[PDB]
Amino acid sequence: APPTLWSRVVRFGSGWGFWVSPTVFITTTHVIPTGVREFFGEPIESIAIHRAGEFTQFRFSRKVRPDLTGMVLEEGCPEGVVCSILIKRDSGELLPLAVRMGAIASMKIQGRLVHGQSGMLLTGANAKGMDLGTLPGDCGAPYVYKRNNDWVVCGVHAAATKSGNTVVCAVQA
Amino acid sequence: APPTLWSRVVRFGSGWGFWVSPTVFITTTHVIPTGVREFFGEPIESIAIHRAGEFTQFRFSRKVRPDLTGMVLEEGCPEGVVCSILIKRDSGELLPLAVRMGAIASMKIQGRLVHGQSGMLLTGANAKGMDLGTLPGDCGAPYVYKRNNDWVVCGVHAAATKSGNTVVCAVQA
Amino acid sequence: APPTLWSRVVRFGSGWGFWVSPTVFITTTHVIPTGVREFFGEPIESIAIHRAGEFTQFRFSRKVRPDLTGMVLEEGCPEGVVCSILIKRDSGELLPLAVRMGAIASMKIQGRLVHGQSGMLLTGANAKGMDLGTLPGDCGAPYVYKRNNDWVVCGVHAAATKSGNTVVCAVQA
Amino acid sequence: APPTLWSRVVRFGSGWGFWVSPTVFITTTHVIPTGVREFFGEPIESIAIHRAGEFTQFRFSRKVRPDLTGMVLEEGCPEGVVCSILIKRDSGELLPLAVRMGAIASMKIQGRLVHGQSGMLLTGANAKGMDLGTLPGDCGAPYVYKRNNDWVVCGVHAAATKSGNTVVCAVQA
Ligand SMILES: [Hg+2]
Ligand SMILES: [Hg+2]
Ligand SMILES: [Hg+2]
Ligand SMILES: [Hg+2]
Ligand SMILES: [Hg+2]
Ligand SMILES: [Hg+2]
Ligand SMILES: [Hg+2]
Ligand SMILES: [Hg+2]
């Protein structure tokens, strides 16, 4: 993509994470590393982690990414809306996939209990290896969309159904 | 769908229900009880009732619909597949709403938490004051789909969010 | 829905057609019957037919539907938006299906050449019998949708592919 | 998709092309460079070009890529199927855009009329300034899908509606 926004999406542990701003940041709780007193090479005390369930924000004071504009980031997405989820993979394939946003709810996905905003993939249903649906490793991916005026992030890729038809994204609200 | 299949959706309560077999009848739990004694004109003590949450099955002792054939009642729709929620509106009308079935969940729909298999409707943003979604009073309508050559049932309509699109199907489990 | 909107969807020859206004009415050209006279009990000159393509309007002096407040009658709809088909059928089944809309080519869907604007149904890739798809008899049926807190008509059903995936919207030129 | 499938997609003309096998190579037409006595360095005269409208196949004399193996090239894919366009950027980046396949058609995307198998892309609902969809130089890329356990090629990227999701694939047909 000519990338102001795929490449704000970066690898972060077992998963991914997103730069909504040079100051702000989004990523999925279960994805964060254990082992540590430091991330984006910064003093772990310096920043305001404001973690919520399976969502987790980072409020930075710094040039971290002086290369990014800052993004609007709303509570959830209204139900109905078709957001996109920005997935990077290993051959670093960039796989945006339309997600038709659902309700907020808790759920039984891959045994676990996930609270976040549900949604269904437009690539119909089935995934077998890497192309039409989501994988274990995509957590952290953002769920962006474009309002009238600007882009907005709505959440992070938190989890998915065995067939990959339904996904849940960790949110703010 | 066919006449003989709508034959089996009957009013029941503040709601509706479904004749899966001659002896078996399915409906949504929140409409049935009121505080009672007997159903379909028969003794409660002569029915085996099975409540799994929002779902409820009655298995009677005598054939209350000998005209019916006997359906399969799977235990939930398989994620991915698209069912037809068989609504009878009390106004002579039939509205066989299409839905993609998602994961099991629990939303917080108006005043209360509901559990069951969630799902997206296949219509725009559905609910509206008046629109093309489920309206209060539809609960208990079956969710049926044609597997092979056969027509089957997964569950019944328990609830649906207010911004439309989302619905919940109660299921045997 | 309750029929106030479905009330503008009356039967019409081969097919259907749609009261947009009381003065006004849309339908697919191929469905208009073998040449006659008088329609909706008015006669030809009352009426100024100003049909063009497979789209056909009818304007009259006589408020034929006064109960109805004419709607905005746009040409197509932008790409993406999902509009609602509003299929009235043989059994009095209302069947609103959703269509993420597309460009306006000329495809050839059956062994006939159909110009209008394409769309895909959200129910899928499989409409085998009574399913979640359009049918031969549906032509005429309206595509509707909410633009502001207002209801715009975008077109009528011209054709569909053997699988139901892809359908064509006849538009006013 | 795997990396041996992407090692197939090379730049060509003003767009790109696909190595179906060692011999055979495929691309859309309007990207073929204009005047010239040879390509992929072997001499024109020894190549068998088959042009089928927007689609063009070059069968070579000698294995020009013995590193790979030869795959199935169907006549286009089937409607409703979801394929992936193996879109390469000139910057390195790999972007397999998901699309759902529809009718053959013909539309005038900008300057002229393109005919091919139309499709709808599955990422939010559009492309822009910089996005989720095609860019003018992407013509030529393949549209693959996995059949049993193997990958097949159903056609090449011929064009796309500006501000939109619609896409046109050139095919054998
Ligand atoms: Hg979103
Ligand atoms: Hg989201
Ligand atoms: Hg079902
Ligand atoms: Hg179900
Ligand atoms: Hg439309
Ligand atoms: Hg339309
Ligand atoms: Hg394909
Ligand atoms: Hg194709």
Automatic annotation (TrEMBL), chains A, B, C, D:
Active site: H30 (for 3clpro activity), E54 (for 3clpro activity), C139 (for 3clpro activity)
Disulfide bonds: C77-C154, C83-C154
Peptidase C37 domain span: 1-173
PTM info: Specific enzymatic cleavages in vivo yield mature proteins. 3CLpro is first autocatalytically cleaved, then processes the whole polyprotein.
Role of this protein: 3C-like protease processes the polyprotein: 3CLpro-RdRp is first released by autocleavage, then all other proteins are cleaved. May cleave polyadenylate-binding protein thereby inhibiting cellular translation.
Protein name: Polyprotein
Organism field: Chiba virus (strain GI/Human/Japan/Chiba 407/1987)
